[PDB]
Each structure stands twice: as structure tokens, then as C-alpha cells.
Amino acid sequence: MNRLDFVDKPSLRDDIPAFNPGDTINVHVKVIEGAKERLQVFKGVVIRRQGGGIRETFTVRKESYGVGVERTFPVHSPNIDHIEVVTRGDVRRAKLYYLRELRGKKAKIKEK
Amino acid sequence: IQQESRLKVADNTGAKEILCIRVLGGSSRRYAGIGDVIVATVKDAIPGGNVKRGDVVKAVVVRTVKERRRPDGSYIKFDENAAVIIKPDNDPRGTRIFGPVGRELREKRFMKIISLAPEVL
Amino acid sequence: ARKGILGTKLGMTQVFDESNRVVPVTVVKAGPNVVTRIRTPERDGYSAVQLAYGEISPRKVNKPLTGQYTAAGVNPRRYLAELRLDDSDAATEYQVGQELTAEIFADGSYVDVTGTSKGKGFAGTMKRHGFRGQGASHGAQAVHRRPGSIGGCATPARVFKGTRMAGRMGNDRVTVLNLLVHKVDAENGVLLIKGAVPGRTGGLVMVRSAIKR
Amino acid sequence: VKVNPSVKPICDKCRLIRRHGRVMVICSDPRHKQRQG
Amino acid sequence: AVPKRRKSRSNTRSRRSQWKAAKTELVGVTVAGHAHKVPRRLLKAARLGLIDF
Amino acid sequence: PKPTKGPRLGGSSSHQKAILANLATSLFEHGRITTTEPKARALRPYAEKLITHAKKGALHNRREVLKKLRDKDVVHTLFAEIGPFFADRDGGYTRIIKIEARKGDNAPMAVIELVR
RNA sequence: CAGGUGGUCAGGUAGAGCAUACCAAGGCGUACGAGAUAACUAUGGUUAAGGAACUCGGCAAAAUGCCCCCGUAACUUCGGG
RNA sequence: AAAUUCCUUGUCGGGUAAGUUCCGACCUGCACGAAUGGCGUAACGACUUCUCAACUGUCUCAACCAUAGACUCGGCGAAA
RNA sequence: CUCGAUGUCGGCUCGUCGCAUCCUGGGGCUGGAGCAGGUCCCAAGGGUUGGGCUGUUCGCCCAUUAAAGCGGCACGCGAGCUGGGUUUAGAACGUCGUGAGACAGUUCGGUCUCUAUCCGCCGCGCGCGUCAGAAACUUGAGGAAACCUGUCCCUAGUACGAGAGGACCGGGACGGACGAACCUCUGGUGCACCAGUUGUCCCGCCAGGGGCACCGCUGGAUAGCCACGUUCGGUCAGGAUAACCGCUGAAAGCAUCUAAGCGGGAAACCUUCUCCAAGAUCAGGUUUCUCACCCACUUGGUGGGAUAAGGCCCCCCGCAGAACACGGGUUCAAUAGGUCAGACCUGGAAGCUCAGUAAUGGGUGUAGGGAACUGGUGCUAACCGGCCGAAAACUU
Numbered sequence A: 001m002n003r004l005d006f007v008d009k010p011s012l013r014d015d016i017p018a019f020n021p022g023d024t025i026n027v028h029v030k031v032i033e034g035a036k037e038r039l040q041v042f043k044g045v046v047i048r049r050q051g052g053g054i055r056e057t058f059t060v061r062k063e064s065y066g067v068g069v070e071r072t073f074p075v076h077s078p079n080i081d082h083i084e085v086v087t088r089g090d091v092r093r094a095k096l097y098y099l100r101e102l103r104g105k106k107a108k109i110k111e112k
Numbered sequence B: 001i002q003q004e005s006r007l008k009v010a011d012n013t014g015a016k017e018i019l020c021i022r023v024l025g026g027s028s029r030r031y032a033g034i035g036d037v038i039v040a041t042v043k044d045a046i047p048g049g050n051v052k053r054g055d056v057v058k059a060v061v062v063r064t065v066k067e068r069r070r071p072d073g074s075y076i077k078f079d080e081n082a083a084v085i086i087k088p089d090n091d092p093r094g095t096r097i098f099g100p101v102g103r104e105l106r107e108k109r110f111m112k113i114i115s116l117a118p119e120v121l
Numbered sequence C: 001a002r003k004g005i006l007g008t009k010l011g012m013t014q015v016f017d018e019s020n021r022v023v024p025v026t027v028v029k030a031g032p033n034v035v036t037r038i039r040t041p042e043r044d045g046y047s048a049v050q051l052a053y054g055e056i057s058p059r060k061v062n063k064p065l066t067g068q069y070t071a072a073g074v075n076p077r078r079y080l081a082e083l084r085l086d087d088s089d090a091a092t093e094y095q096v097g098q099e100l101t102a103e104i105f106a107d108g109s110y111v112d113v114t115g116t117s118k119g120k121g122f123a124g125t126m127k128r129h130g131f132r133g134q135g136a137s138h139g140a141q142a143v144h145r146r147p148g149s150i151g152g153c154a155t156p157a158r159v160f161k162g163t164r165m166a167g168r169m170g171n172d173r174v175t176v177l178n179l180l181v182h183k184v185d186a187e188n189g190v191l192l193i194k195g196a197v198p199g200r201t202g203g204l205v206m207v208r209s210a211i212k213r
Numbered sequence D: 001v002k003v004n005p006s007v008k009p010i011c012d013k014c015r016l017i018r019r020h021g022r023v024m025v026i027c028s029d030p031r032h033k034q035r036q037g
Numbered sequence E: 001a002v003p004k005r006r007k008s009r010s011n012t013r014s015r016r017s018q019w020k021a022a023k024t025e026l027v028g029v030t031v032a033g034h035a036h037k038v039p040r041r042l043l044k045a046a047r048l049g050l051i052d053f
Numbered sequence F: 001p002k003p004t005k006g007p008r009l010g011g012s013s014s015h016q017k018a019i020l021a022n023l024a025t026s027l028f029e030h031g032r033i034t035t036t037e038p039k040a041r042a043l044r045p046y047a048e049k050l051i052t053h054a055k056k057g058a059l060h061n062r063r064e065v066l067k068k069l070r071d072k073d074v075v076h077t078l079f080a081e082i083g084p085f086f087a088d089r090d091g092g093y094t095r096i097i098k099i100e101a102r103k104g105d106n107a108p109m110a111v112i113e114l115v116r
Numbered sequence G: 001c002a003g004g005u006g007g008u009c010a011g012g013u014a015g016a017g018c019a020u021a022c023c024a025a026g027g028c029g030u031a032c033g034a035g036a037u038a039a040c041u042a043u044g045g046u047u048a049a050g051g052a053a054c055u056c057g058g059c060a061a062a063a064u065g066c067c068c069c070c071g072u073a074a075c076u077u078c079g080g081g
Numbered sequence H: 001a002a003a004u005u006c007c008u009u010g011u012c013g014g015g016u017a018a019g020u021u022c023c024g025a026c027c028u029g030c031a032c033g034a035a036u037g038g039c040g041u042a043a044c045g046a047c048u049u050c051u052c053a054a055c056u057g058u059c060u061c062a063a064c065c066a067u068a069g070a071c072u073c074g075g076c077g078a079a080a
Numbered sequence I: 001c002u003c004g005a006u007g008u009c010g011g012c013u014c015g016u017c018g019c020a021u022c023c024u025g026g027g028g029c030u031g032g033a034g035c036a037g038g039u040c041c042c043a044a045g046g047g048u049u050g051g052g053c054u055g056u057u058c059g060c061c062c063a064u065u066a067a068a069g070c071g072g073c074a075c076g077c078g079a080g081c082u083g084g085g086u087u088u089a090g091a092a093c094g095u096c097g098u099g100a101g102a103c104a105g106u107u108c109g110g111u112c113u114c115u116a117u118c119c120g121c122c123g124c125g126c127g128c129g130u131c132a133g134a135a136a137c138u139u140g141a142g143g144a145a146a147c148c149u150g151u152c153c154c155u156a157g158u159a160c161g162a163g164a165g166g167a168c169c170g171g172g173a174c175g176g177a178c179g180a181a182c183c184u185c186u187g188g189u190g191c192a193c194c195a196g197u198u199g200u201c202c203c204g205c206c207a208g209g210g211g212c213a214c215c216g217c218u219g220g221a222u223a224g225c226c227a228c229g230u231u232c233g234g235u236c237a238g239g240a241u242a243a244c245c246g247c248u249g250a251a252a253g254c255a256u257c258u259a260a261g262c263g264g265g266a267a268a269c270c271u272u273c274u275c276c277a278a279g280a281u282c283a284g285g286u287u288u289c290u291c292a293c294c295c296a297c298u299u300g301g302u303g304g305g306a307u308a309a310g311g312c313c314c315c316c317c318g319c320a321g322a323a324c325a326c327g328g329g330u331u332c333a334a335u336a337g338g339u340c341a342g343a344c345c346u347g348g349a350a351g352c353u354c355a356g357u358a359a360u361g362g363g364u365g366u367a368g369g370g371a372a373c374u375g376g377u378g379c380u381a382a383c384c385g386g387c388c389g390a391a392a393a394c395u396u
Ligand SMILES: CC[C@H]1OC(=O)[C@H](C)[C@@H](O[C@H]2C[C@@](C)(OC)[C@@H](O)[C@H](C)O2)[C@H](C)[C@@H](O[C@@H]2O[C@H](C)C[C@H](N(C)C)[C@H]2O)[C@](C)(OC)C[C@@H](C)C(=O)[C@H](C)[C@@H](O)[C@]1(C)O
Pocket: I005, I007, I111, I112, I113
């Protein structure tokens, strides 16, 4: 990719935490809803990290009001300035596409 | 999300089901997004309340399971489809709505649902 | 003049723009490797320019081609394409032995990029023409995906010319217009192009400035 | 114009002129302005 | 469908003649014995030995 | 080995697995093995990877070679002689040669050999 | 010749079974082959969102599937269902 | 208004978003009617007709995959 | 005409043409205030949806919509499909006939055959031609494709109007449907990937695996292909025009758009654009390369042979492909393979160790496995090759 690798090399993001699926994280995103700026702290669990470099995206799954939301952010995306990780976790899968309980009992991935 | 698609009415008017009769907005348009008026019959409401069954009434979609791309580069996938009935004036027929709403509604501008949503986006 | 240049494409990426959007962008190495051999509108009535681009060894090219590179005074290049210019020659815009680079396209200047497609094979009338081919269940004996009919019975007792039929599609030179260049890397060659360039990754692509502004 | 292919004058001001193939009339008041064929 | 008519021997013969057979031979190949003209495809097993004849 | 496009060898992919493991068993038995050229084209990468494990030489390499060649003993020979025999070659363990096409199907035959 | 042809014996393991899956005795690889990512056809597979909108018609597929345990309507000829 | 009705999509209600089909009632029954059985009739039905949920590539709108063919090569080698 | 067979309706698929235009374009009149509306003229380039009832065209209706054309082509289209309807044989009703049977009366059930020879069309090649032989770029005669449209904001609540209402013309935004291209993102798939896993068998046994059960099944899944994805397109602009409008202006001292003249004028025509294209036999052009080259005749021409430049055939390949073609490569090589380091996929190897009654869990340890994507590296295969290829008869 060396020269396409260079096409994206000055287009990276830095110091962002290490996080794999399972980690509950807390994405402070830039959204301009109403005023001249706003930050929405989308908290949830990373149920996916489809990688690639800059092309790498995670999918934070929140459970909002008896209804979930699967919000697929790109890493390195400039509408993100704080991917706070709340809680880590070493889970079995790499894509956590089973999170369809919403009864909560098994909606929580056990700690690590 | 098209004609013959039951999607749960999330507002305080009793309806839990609407089969989209039409997708209002274009000739031979098919798929209604997060925030585009659909027609909808009423498959299932409370008997006696605000609305009955079988009513050809508009509605606005606030939840589609299919990911909507925002022109930033991120997506918004929801768990279950949802449409708040509306009036022809920039007002929802209902007064509150249950659950988040796709922010893709500040643009189509019924900015009274984005007002009365429990959480926008 | 219509400022154009050759180049090959290195693949797609996405780059984030000023307004915090996404630019699903194609990288085209139009790098500073395009030299010329003018075509007078008097000797041969074009007013076009002969842009070369490529890196091959002498051993790799045959005698006629290397002779044309020597008579132009340049070391051979794998490709050698041509670009029309105008109703005018103007005798100062170019020169035989000139050098180009992707730098002319000035970060916003819309280009229209042309090149041969990816061969979609010997593709039948649904990968080729978009036929809502006949049904799949209700008794349709064998004619799923199959054309259907070709015209009527006795007056056109013949199939009209240009009837949409199965055949080898792909590879035909296509021109995708109005591709707003997002960035230009004259410091390692490439040119970003907000859009979808036609062709195999690593293939010839002529990046012409637009005509529609 | 009212185009009927049998053209007559309406009032005492229509002029059955001929004008480049079609035979039109003019009463200088476009109430009819009719024209033939 | 069936042949509506039989073929004029012109057409018949004209594409019985497009029923050719290919060719290649690489003459003068010294191997054990007198130089055999094995094809350019096989001449490595001609040299090494892994060829009958 | 990248996969093959087009119809897999023998019958389906399962018979292709079995074919490849059999051809590699007898390759690491005799060294010189004749097949039809497409079988050898499919087997050259596959066998060269196995021999890469051979010249690695550890219980994990033995256990990842026994996941192709069932035979304990041809693999004993693999991780005994054929393995160390390639103490030098980094890649390039086998060698295809062209035989004359099998009478009866005109199948282009090829002999694949461990380099020595 | 992919059909049909009476009766006999019929093991293991899982299983209720002589079904089914894998195997023993015993058989066999049964008779054109090598390839090859064309369309298209057949046989199977899976599919985002929606769920009959397809259609003459839910045709076809899908789902349900089993063991145990509760529970089980109308109507009934009082057995049922 | 029926396996029975021509006019005919008779009329009115239920169902539908919209119901020439279905259900109930009406009743000028062209042309019902009592062992050529009349009206019913629980269970039964690879019967016909309709509605409803599960469900699904049926469909919106198709895509990809594997084998048997097709295609290529060697062998024999038809037919209407 | 066809009876030694011209397969009938409706639907589907695919079209295609006409204008008698539903919309979009330009207009005239209007009993046209504005919105509009109604009628006539020109205009075929695009477009002209989804459903409910019906075998149904026919319709009626629901929700739209810019609009939801009317026709032709064997009421287009069954060697392209479905077979619901018609008009086979079974069966029942009502009615007719003594009766067998009957009913453009009804109601259930009721086999849709063919490996494509010629034309046609869609793609691909081989041979020759193109007055020496090539090679690269191309000119562009002639073609084809393509041509849709809505809302909103200012203008401006302006004009027009008692007022509800309410502009034209112009500038900008947001879309719908259609098409093309690409695979970055989303998403689909994934028969040589990873892990989990149920039955059974095997590898002597345990551990660790593996064979088969739709790939056994289940969770993923890079490449590739693709759409549900992204991006791009539709145009602006010129010429001649139709309807219509107009100037100058007679005959026919006027009046006229017409006779001479000139101007406006549209999604329709040629242009503009995208694509093919010199087999455009009218077979083009710019440039570059090779040019004694030996035998025999009837000196010569004429055959032969040899080669030049070039190309092919072999071989290694390809995200190029049915074959062929096309493109890349051939030792001065990174073309395939292998090997190494990557990007990614999976998800935490085996062994050893420690905890645990054990199931199993922690450590070694982003482990380990691995396919396509990237870059290295001369180890394997591109192999001391075969072929086919010029020399012009000459004139003002
Ligand atoms: C094993 C294969 C069989 O395939 C079929 O069943 C076909 C589908 C038939 O269509 C059947 C089945 C049918 C249901 O579908 C087509 C039906 O509609 C039709 C009446 O006969 C035929 C093709 C009929 O042709 C058609 O028959 C009509 C009388 C005239 C038609 N055309 C006007 C000249 C003509 O094409 C045919 C005469 O048999 C009678 C053919 C005759 C040789 C036979 O009877 C053969 C024994 C047939 O069994 C067969 C072909 O071998």
C-alpha cells in the first residue's frame, strides 16, 4: 500500500485507546445540534471493529429507551475527540453480533 | 422499508402497527428513510382512544434497522422500526414519542419531533 | 487548452474533508512522469499533444517506438497516449521534451477521468443490461435470468440491430466526469480524486480537466 | 388562433390575406385571428 | 430445431476445413542417442530424461 | 495456497483436499511423482508449504502437518530427512517437469519433484 | 438400461426404530477422461431491510420439528376436537 | 344471487387501504325443494373457496458460492 | 393464403414504432383580474409508479403522482416463459331432450415437445486486403448510447386583487426515479481461512487432531464479484426550425410577417458531450524502424530460398479470459510459485506450568492459524528456442 499507505498516513489519529470488541467505551462525538457546537457522549459497548487502518470503524451499541442503537463510528474520524473507554473485557468473539437480548440479563458482558 | 411494511408507531396515540400504504415524496419511490413521510394504515391501536384501525394516515419514520450513513462517515442502526404519525402542518398527531429518533430529522424539518424526542440521535 | 495528464490509479481510500465529512476518494498516481511530443494542427490537423508515461527498460520496447522516443528526445515510456488541445496550436503552451506533473489540477479543479473498465466477462443480459429477468418460482420452467423475447412475429421477421443481447461486456473506455480533486501530492506523486475512477487498480487513466465547470 | 380548415371573415374588419402557405385572416383584434389548415 | 435444408457442399466443406490441428517441434535436441525433435513444450524432460522415446 | 478458481480438482473441495494430501504423501514418500499438470499446479504451493513446516521442525509444525497428511510415518520422514534437506532453500522446494500427455484423455502430464 | 423382481440373515455406536448419522463382516470406487471461475440451465447453499407487496393461487421454499412438564376454546354423536 | 342467478360487480352490513372472491341477511328462485333425498352434520379430507399470525429470495431486486452441463483438449460418435 | 397444422386469451420478459400528447417544452385564443382554468396550434426527446377485486382486457376503488397516454407490430412476444381462461376425456347443479346426450349456462380436476442448419441479432476470433514489410499514436465519414422530473427558499406576500387568495421572470437549496463506474465505507456472499461444536470412526492409547454427516452445524470473515453502497451523469452553450411572433414592404398610391429581404423562436433536427469507428475497398494521416539478399531459369520478369524490422507458436501468468483474443513476463526477471516482514480475517494455538473434587479457568502470549492485498528476496518455473516475415511494373 506504500504510496496509498502514504495517502492515508498524514490522515491518521493518535493516542486513541486500545479497544477490541467487548470493551464498553464512551465516544464523545462532535455534533452541531442547535448551537455553534455540541458534544454527545454516546456510551455503549464495542460490538465490532472492522479494521483496515484509517478505514477502521467500531460499532458502539447503546440501549437507549427499551430500544437499542448500533452507532457505527469510524476510528480516526474527526467528529470524535474522546473515545473514553469505560470498562475493558477479554471476550470470546471478535464481532459480538449476538447482542439481541434487551432483557438485560445477558446484555452485560462480564468484567475483566 | 416500503409499501406493506409494519413498523411500530412510537407515540402516545395508541397505534402499535401501521402498514405503510405509500412512500410519499416521489413517483415510483420505494424506500422511506429515517425521516420521510409515509402514508400508513392502522393495523393495531387501542379501541376507543385517539385513533381507530384502518385509517389512511401519514406518518414519519424515526427508526430504520438499515444503517443510515451520515455524510460524516458514521452510521445509525436501530433495533426496531418506528413511525410517529403526523399532521399536515409540522406537528405530530401525538405529544410524546418513545425512544430515540434518528437525527436525520432536523433536515426534513418537523423540528417538533426532534423537540419532543426523549433523545435525538 | 484543456489541461490533462496521464497516470495510473493506486486504489481507493477515504479522506476526511475540511467540514468534517468523508471523501470516498480514489488515488491516482498522475505523478511527474508525463512528457510530450506535440501534434501540430498543420502537419496532421489535430492540435493535440502526445503525453508519455511509464518506466520501461530499452530492451522492453521495439525499434519503431524507441525511434519515436529518440526523435522526440525522451527515454521510452510504457504508455504513450494523446490528448486533443484546441482549434489552436499557440506554439508556446507545450514543447517536445516537456515535463508534466499532477500539479496543474489545483485542489478543487474538477477533472473528468477516462480509462478502460474492468471486464465484467462474457456477461449475460442481466449483468450486462439489467433485465428484470423472468420469475423464479411460479412455474417459470427454465427462463429465470433469460432474456425473454426478441421482437415480434412476421413484419420484423428479424431481430432489430442493437437488440440488447448477451455478449462480452467490460473493458470499454469510460469517462467519469466532474471528479473534484480533493488533494494533490506533488511531493510523492499522487492526485486524490473525490469519486470512483474507472478501471483496474494499477491501470492507465487519463485525468483531463473538466468541460462542465 | 382558431384553426378550422374552412376560413371566412367574422366581422367587417377581417382581411383574407394569404401568408406563406397557410391562408390566415386578420381583423387586427385577436378575438379569433383564425387560420386555415 | 432441425436443419431446415441440407447444406450446399460449399458450406459443408468450407467449415470442415476449419477443423485443423496445431503444431510445434523443436528440432535438433541432443539427448541420449541421435538428436530427437521433441516439442518446445517438453524439452526439459527431454534433456533430463523423463520422456518416452 | 490461495484457492483455485473454477472447478476444484477431483470432484468438489473435499475430494480436492483428499487428492492434495494423497499427492503430498506420495511426494514425501518417493520425491518424484507424476500427475496431470493441473494436479501438480495445485500441489506445488501446498507441498512447498508443508516442507516449510518440515524445515521448521517442532511439535507444532508436526501437529500442523499431521492436520494434512494423516500418515504418521511419511511425516516422520518429512520431519526427519526431507525437512533438514532444505537447510538452505528459502522457498523453492519442488520442481515441475513436463511429461507427454497421457494417452486416453490427452491429459497433460507433469512430474513434480522435491528439488533433490 | 437410474425402472421392476418373491423370501431369508441382518453387527456396532447415538437413537424409540429394521428411520437417520458414522462404522464391522463383507463389498465397491461400474466402465469416457483432463481441465476450465463464460453466458445460461439443473441441483443444493446463504442474504442485508421489508415480509405475500409475487401470484390465477403462499405454487415452490421457509418456518414449526423432539423429550419432558404445565395449559388447552368453540362445538360435540360425548368418542372426540 | 346457491357447485343451482341471465341480467350480475343485484342490495345492505362484516372483513380490506382498496374485496367482481369470502361471510351474514334480504328473496322478481331466468331455472331450488324433499330418499333422481330437503336442511343440517362433531370427526375426517394430498377436495374446492376465503381470511389470519409464524415464516420465508415468492417479491420489491436481485447478488454471491459448490457441484452436473455448457466451453476447451484427446476417444468413439448419433438423430429428427 | 394456410386443413399432408399459420399453437387461441390474459400475465410475464424483451421490445419496438406511430401521433390521434397524459406529463415535461414553446405558443394563440379565452366569457383569460391573480391562481388558475377551458379550448385550439407546434412538438415524440425522455417519462408515463405501487396495490385491492377479477383468468379477466374491461373496469371500480385505495395511496399517490409531474403524469399515472392511445395505439401498431399474427388483438407484437409459448423452437422465450405461465396455463389462471378458452373448446378433449372425469364429476355436480340448474335447464333442454322419452333417451343417448345438451347448453358463448355454471363449478371443481385436467402432459406446454425439439441438441438451432440459413437468415436475424449479440460477442469474439482467423484469413486477406489496405501496391515493400512492420510498429505507436491516433484523424473522423458514418454510427450508437443518452435526452425524465418534483419540491422548497428569496424575488415577494411583489404584481393582480374588496379580501380569502395570489403571480410571471430571475437566483439558490433539497430530492425522486433511471443509467454508468467503482469496492473506500455500509451490506450480501464466501466448498484450500479462523474458532466453537453435536453423532461416529480413525490416527495404538491420553493429549492433539483428522475423515464423513447440506461446507455437518453455528459465530465471524480479507480478496474477488456484487447492491442495499459510494461517486458521477442528465446539462450549460451554438445553428437551423415548427407553431406562433416581428421588422422593412409592395403588387393592389393603402393594410399586411411575404412576393424580394431580415429577426425572434422549443425537451423535437444537426451541432455540444460520452462511447465505437479507415473492411470509410473513398481501405486516411503524423512519425519511427528495416532495405542489395543469395540460387536457378526464359537475361529479365518469375518462382524459390535467406533473413531485416516485426509479429507469432512454445513456456510463467493475469482483478484478461468460454476457445481465440487482450495485457504482463522470460535471467539484465520480480511474471506466477515459494520464502520473509507487513495490511487484514479469526480470536487467544500446542506444550509446559499453576488453580480447581472436577467441568473448566488463569500464565507463557495480540498468542496461533491463514487465501487472494502490499513490499522484499534470485530458491522453483518461465529452459542454452521454432516459426512467419521485405526488395516495389510504371507514367506529367
Ligand atoms: C414426450 C414428448 C411429447 O411432448 C408433448 O406432450 C407436447 C407438449 C405435445 O403437445 C400437447 C400438449 C399440450 C398440453 O401442450 C402443448 C397441448 O396444448 C397440445 C394440444 O398437445 C406436442 C407438441 C403436440 O404438438 C401440438 O399438438 C397440437 C395438436 C397442434 C400443435 N400446433 C398447433 C401444431 C402442436 O404443436 C403433439 C402433436 O402431440 C399432441 C406432438 C405429437 C408428436 C405427440 O403426441 C408426441 C407423442 C408428444 O407426446 C411429444 C411431443 O412427443
